[PDB]
Amino acid sequence: DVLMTQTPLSLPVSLGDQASISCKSSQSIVHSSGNTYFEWYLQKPGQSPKLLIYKVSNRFSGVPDRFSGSGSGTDFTLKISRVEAEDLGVYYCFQGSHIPFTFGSGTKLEIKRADAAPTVSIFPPSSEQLTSGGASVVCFLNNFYPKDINVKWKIDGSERQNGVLNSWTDQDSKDSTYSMSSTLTLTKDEYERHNSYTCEATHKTSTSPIVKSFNR
């Protein structure tokens, strides 16, 4: 099969700047007709792909002129000028010249925006969970930027590391921020032997940690 290699894998670009995404095929993707059936697609999280460019450099109806494509034979580049927030997503190249048609592995376009401090909220275990013998303390750290953040949990002032589960959302298509959920799950037995549960976040927007706590 024709292997389609994309670069970069991740592409952070500030709003307004230009982003260049490339694709290299393992062999020529010039179809026998002389045409080159190469396209660029963009897929946003939880959405179906959308066509951007076809036949290497032709913008599909409805596509902003900020998008353009170039290249030939085995090397192609999509250029997105004046990057906007809604450009967020994974870009894929594709060749429809040789069977089987093949796709590149995708390039995730990360948007660089103004730093934003997270809004942190902590929640104690529900009665339903306690009844089942477990006890999760949840901490949401919402709408922050940059994505880089460290969350530390403390129980009665002592750092706690076992039982922590973190999860992060994809960048927001509207405000370009990230959000994170950090859950500390103990057994009810252990939860009931302590008093203070703290979620503290280290982020560049604050010289010192943002601290939220829940006391039993």
Binding site: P49, L51, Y54, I99, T119, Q129, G134, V138, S167, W168
Partner: protein, 209 residues
Amino acid sequence: QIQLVQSGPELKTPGETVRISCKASGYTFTTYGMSWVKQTPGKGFKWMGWINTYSGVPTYADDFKGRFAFSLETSASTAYLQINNLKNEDTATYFCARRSWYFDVWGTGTTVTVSSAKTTPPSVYPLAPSMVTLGCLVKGYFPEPVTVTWNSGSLSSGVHTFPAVLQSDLYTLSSSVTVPSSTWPSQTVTCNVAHPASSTKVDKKIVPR
């Protein structure tokens, strides 16, 4: 008005068969070839082949010659994808997409999950404390996916639903919603956690502790 609407999500065990549909509207079905593309989180997009909608002849990529069949029902402007003797690895989102010299229209995608593991419904826990953030913690379910909405979908702004994480305790996910403080608890906020696999939906109204 041109659309390719695909059938809903399926959950099957290995060895079973599944048939997915892709219905075109807004254009003459027989004027565009229809391709089928498999998408997985750990391999990306894989073109499975296509079917000529005028002649009815299918073309299968080599990795899909065998257990897969493409067929049509032109009177209903529908393309079908049938997968026989399902395998765990067939777990993926399948898209139909029409193609002239590009895929200008893609279907809505159909997620097929194939697992021999025991389905286990979700335990849903309420997360209560100018703006107030609330949430739901969803634990102990299998397999993915779980769908979370707030107020049956009418509360969509300020929502953050986090990707699931599988651990010893099976899948865990959480979702937060932020609303004006003056509107809760006066205007109720309920999370609805749907788990098609277990044919279960749990609705938890968040109330003050």
